[PDB]
Design a protein around this ligand. Structure first.
Ligand SMILES: *[C@@H]1O[C@H](CO)[C@@H](O)[C@H](O)[C@H]1NC(C)=O
Length: 123
């Protein structure tokens, strides 16, 4: 299992073409990633989204020449969630890597960062 607290940042996401939140590995066919936020209106206003990549697929994208554009690489995520509620549970079926992006990432006042808590459960 894993627990992480932090904040989703438009600046961090724009800087790296997706803000890297974390990574995880698990044994078995399914795991549950639970994401909690309080500021839903700010997330909806930014079109906040999470992108999950299988780290082997993500590495293949980064090793491609010339390389994918910001939007094309995020469109190749294995799983996504559009952040519209205080909690979203993602069933991850099969290392995995999690990224945050919003309407400013692949392009206006960018507002403030969105605090979050993420819990990963392996069953
Ligand atoms: C996420 O999973 C937890 C644990 O089963 C549950 O308590 C919670 O209600 C779920 N939330 C949503 C939005 O499905």
């Amino acid at each position: 299992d894993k627990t992480l607290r932090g904040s989703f940042s438009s600046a961090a996401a724009r800087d790296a073409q997706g803000q890297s939140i974390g990574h995880f590995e698990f044994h078995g066919d399914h795991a549950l990633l639970c994401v909690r936020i309080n500021n839903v209106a700010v997330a909806v206003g930014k079109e906040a989204k999470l992108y999950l990549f299988q780290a082997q697929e993500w590495l293949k994208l980064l090793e491609s020449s010339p390389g994918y554009s910001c939007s094309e690489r995020l469109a190749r995520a294995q799983l996504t969630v559009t952040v519209t509620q205080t909690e979203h549970n993602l069933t991850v079926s099969q290392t995995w890597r999690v990224f945050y992006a919003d309407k400013f990432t692949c392009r206006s006042p960018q507002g403030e960062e969105i605090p979050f808590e993420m819990v990963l459960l392996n069953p």
